[PDB]
């Protein structure tokens, strides 16, 4: 493709290397993507609202294009979240009078949605984020209070996994979440999946989002989350990895490029992280970055609107950053 080696090829015997994509990137960054990633995830085009905007109408155009792109190139595809409190259209939770949908309506609608979406790509998607972010960040709260929990019921996770498993018994079913390394939330997610497994739910993996930064979480904290989750006998996927140069509610907004400090910390940070991933390659089977290159990232608008970020190992011009070289795998 040019000079630099293929990132995914360097991990061909350890774990997949993926990237979140959007159709707009294909006929422009398609060459770069096929070069460095052997796994892709629709950043947004497979979400409920994106593929099922209205009750009786599905819009799979974008998702279909991404899948054609990947499968024709031997690139794997992770399906992103079927059940999530965000990006799910209002119709799903409402009845004809605009009131709340009943438990029965919720169940039949969820069944048809999963059957349509999961069934559509049957045998083509190696892993599905079945339930996303069900655990609360608040210390004294376990289950996030969402319409799924209120309208469908406390068994909404079991239901989702059973339905997904039925739509495609060959796909690996994942429970995906962020802040997965925080000791308190870690134990909640651990107990959740454990209880799901004890209930017979077909959950085959835990997705560690990996929305980290140059200051944390620590190697020790990440290590503990890994061993903790792996002890449930499930595969582990780092699903939305990015290393923000900013912290939580950062007050800095004048940066037009990372500071010399940020660049140096990020490079070392990425080296440490992938060093840890290699150590646990027996538990981690896929590592996906939530983007392709610094020219685009959802962090450019979250949590702060219009604040440019540079979270990847590839810069705004798709050129490798120092971190890239320190991340190359051993194969």
From Swiss-Prot:
Activity regulation description: Completely inhibited by Ag(2+), Cu(2+), Hg(2+), Mn(2+), Pb(2+) and Sn(2+). Strongly inhibited by Fe(2+) and Zn(2+). Co(2+) and Ni(2+) cause little inhibition while Ca(2+) and Mg(2+) do not affect enzyme activity, and Ba(2+) produces a small stimulating effect. Irreversibly inactivated by SDS in vitro.
GO biological process per UniProt: xylan catabolic process
GO (cellular component) term, any one: cytoplasm
Dependence of activity on temperature: Optimum temperature is 50 degrees Celsius. Loses 100% activity after incubation for 15 minutes at 50 degrees Celsius.
GO terms of molecular function: endo-1,4-beta-xylanase activity
Catalytic residues in the record: 133, 240
Protein name: Endo-1,4-beta-xylanase B
Organism listed in the record: Paenibacillus barcinonensis
Pfam families linked to this entry: Glyco_hydro_10 (PF00331)
InterPro entries the UniProt entry points to: GH10 (IPR044846), GH10_dom (IPR001000), Glycoside_hydrolase_SF (IPR017853)
Organism lineage: Bacteria, Bacillati, Bacillota, Bacilli, Bacillales
